[PDB]
Amino acid sequence: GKNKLLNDLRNLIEKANTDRKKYEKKLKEEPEDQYGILAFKSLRWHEEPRETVSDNSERSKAYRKLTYGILNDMNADELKRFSEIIILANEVEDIFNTSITLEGNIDYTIIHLYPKKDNLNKLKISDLENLKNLFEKLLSTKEIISKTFKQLLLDYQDDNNSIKADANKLKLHVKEIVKQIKEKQEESEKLKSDILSIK
Numbered sequence: 599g600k601n602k603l604l605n606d607l608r609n610l611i612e613k614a615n616t617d618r619k620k621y622e623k624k625l626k627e628e629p630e631d632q633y634g635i636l637a638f639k640s641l642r643w644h645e646e647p648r649e650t651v652s653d654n655s656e657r658s659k660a661y662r663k664l665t666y667g668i669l670n671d672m673n674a675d676e677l678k679r680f681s682e683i684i685i686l687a688n689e690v691e692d693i694f695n696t697s698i699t700l701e702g703n704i705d706y707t708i709i710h711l712y713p714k715k716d717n718l719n720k721l722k723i724s725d726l727e728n729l730k731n732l733f734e735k736l737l738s739t740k741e742i743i744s745k746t747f748k749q750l751l752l753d754y755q756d757d758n759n760s761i762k763a764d765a766n767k768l769k770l771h772v773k774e775i776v777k778q779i780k781e782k783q784e785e786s787e788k789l790k791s792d793i794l795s796i797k
Contacts, residue, residue: 599723600723600726603723603726603727603730604718604719604726606730607715607718607726607729607730607733608715608718610730610733610734610737611708611711611712611715611733612712612715614704614708614737615708615712617667617670618667618705618708618709620670621663621664621666621667621670622663624663624666625659625662625663625666628662632652632662633666633674633677633678634674634677634678634681635662635665635677635678635680635681636678636681636682636685637681637684637685637690637694638650638651638652638658638662638665639651639652640685640690640691641661641690641691641694641695643657643658651665651694661698664698664701664702664705665694665697665698665701667701667704667705668697668698668700668701668740668743668744668747669744669747670744671744671748672747672748672751676748676751679751679754680747680750680751683750683751683754683768683772684772686765686768687765687768687769687772688769689769689772689773689776692776692780693772693775693776693779696776696779696780696783697743697747697779697783699783699786700739700740700743700779700782700783700786701740703736703783703786703787703789703790704736704737704739704740704786704790706790707733707736707789707790707793707794710793710794711733711793721796725796728796729793729796732789732792732793733789733793735789736786736789736790736793739782739783739785739786739789740786742782743778743779743782746775746778746779750771750772750775753771754768759771
């Protein structure tokens with residue numbers, strides 16, 4: 599049991615770390631139009647110097663990279679369309695800030711675990727079991743949000759529930775997504791804090 603857990607957990611951690619490198623690469627190769635994610639230009643930090651997520655500060659680049667992570671199952675065309683749909687709903691802040699916070703909890707957890715992964719053998723079986731279940735649950739939060747965003751793109755294209763024909767219906771539906779993201783985001787905070795508690 600211990601041997602298998604050690605293995606499964608290195609596999610999870612090593613594989614999550616590879617995905618993270620993917621997102622760094624999408625930032626390093628980002629086109630000047632930032633994959634048509636015009637939403638970035640409408641996210642302005644409240645603290646000085648009050649730049650946008652579209653600007654090239656270090657924290658803005660980080661926020662974009664976390665964006666590429668949470669939208670990672672989309673191509674350039676789906677990325678631009680996602681942005682368009684959220685702008686049309688006028689919910690850039692609540693959708694993007696919530697999503698990127700969730701992603702940021704995953705990212706933080708991965709950088710926390712990665713340097714320590716050859717040291718997992720200091721843990722007892724029940725701690726490893728707990729760690730594995732927490733990390734898997736953390737990764738699922740992201741996967742739920744990613745699927746929610748992919749379905750939005752399909753629902754919109756199909757005009758399900760008139761969300762394409764009618765801005766008011768889009769808005770109501772996008773609000774419900776905000777509610778769901780916010781729950782998963784809160785869930786990610788606790789899973790993260792529980793993983794950080796294992797010492």
